[PDB]
């Protein structure tokens, strides 16, 4: 199973372990994971927070020709769970200093939920991309502005957490993943730029 081939110890997540649009699995309803984790789920995870890790550094990226991404779902692995990882780092000053937090965001989340969110809408300015999506897709991806969510982490250790800006999208870009819910779904049919008064559009 696809399961297996991933968590080999030896093992790298690159692009083709990737599953693409029209692969019957990025549309399921993804099964919730059972606590205590199984050794699989919990080194899958484990092997998520690296591929992004590696997606972002320049070298690593580069050798594994990697496309660069802040969060993955089991899912886009063929892996019909639960479980999503989320890393977004924060940015260098005008002077080249690192930032006091490398992220803003750095999680592998089992059965994340949204439990709330904002009547406000949000969407990025440039719009999103997906691993799975090997097309040109524009328009604003219209999502929650904030939210309020529930995980667990591979310890059974429950969180509940308040997110806006960018870790807000890029949350609810892999619970939808988890929903067999894809980010065009969320585009206007017709003008995929209208903007109903009150969107908060993110640069
Ligand atoms: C807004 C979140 C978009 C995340 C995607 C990667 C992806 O497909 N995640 O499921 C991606 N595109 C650019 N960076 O990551
Ligand atoms: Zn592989
Ligand atoms: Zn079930
Ligand atoms: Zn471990
Ligand atoms: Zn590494
Ligand atoms: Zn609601
Ligand atoms: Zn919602
Ligand atoms: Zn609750
Ligand atoms: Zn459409």
Same mark, same amino acid.
Not at 27 to 41: D, G, I, M, N, W
Not at 42 to 49: P, R, S, T
Not at 61 to 79: C, M, N, S, T
Not at 102 to 119: G, T
């Given at each position: *199973? ?21 692969? %019957? ?11 205590? +984790? ?7 995870? #484990?092997?998520?927070? =690296?591929?992004?890790?590696?997606? =972002? ?16 779902? *089991? %899912? ?12 977004? %780092?924060?940015?260098?000053?005008? =002077? ?41 897709? %524009? ?32 949350? =609810? ?20 730029? *209208?903007?109903?008064?009150?969107? +908060?559009?993110? #640069?």
């Amino acid at each position: *199973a696809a399961i297996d081939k991933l968590v080999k110890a030896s093992h790298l997540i690159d692009m083709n372990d990737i599953i693409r649009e029209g692969n %019957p699995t990025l549309r399921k309803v993804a099964e919730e994971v059972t606590f205590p +984790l199984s050794e699989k789920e919990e080194i899958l995870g #484990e092997k998520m927070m =690296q591929f992004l890790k590696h997606s =972002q550094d320049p070298i690593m990226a580069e050798k594994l020709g990697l496309r660069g991404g802040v969060g993955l779902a *089991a %899912p886009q692995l063929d892996i019909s769970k639960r479980i999503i990882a989320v890393l977004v %780092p924060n940015v260098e000053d005008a =002077q080249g200093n690192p930032p006091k937090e490398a992220y803003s965001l750095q999680e592998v989340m089992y059965n994340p939920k949204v439990v709330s969110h904002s009547v406000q809408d949000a969407a990025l300015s440039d719009g999103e991309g997906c691993l799975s999506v090997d097309r040109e897709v %524009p328009g604003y991806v219209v999502r929650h502005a904030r939210v309020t969510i529930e995980y667990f982490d591979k310890t059974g250790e429950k969180h509940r957490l308040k997110l806006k800006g960018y870790n807000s999208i890029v949350v =609810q870009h892999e619970i939808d993943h988890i929903d067999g819910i894809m980010f065009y779904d969320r585009i206007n049919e017709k003008n995929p730029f *209208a903007v109903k008064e009150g969107l +908060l559009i993110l #640069e």
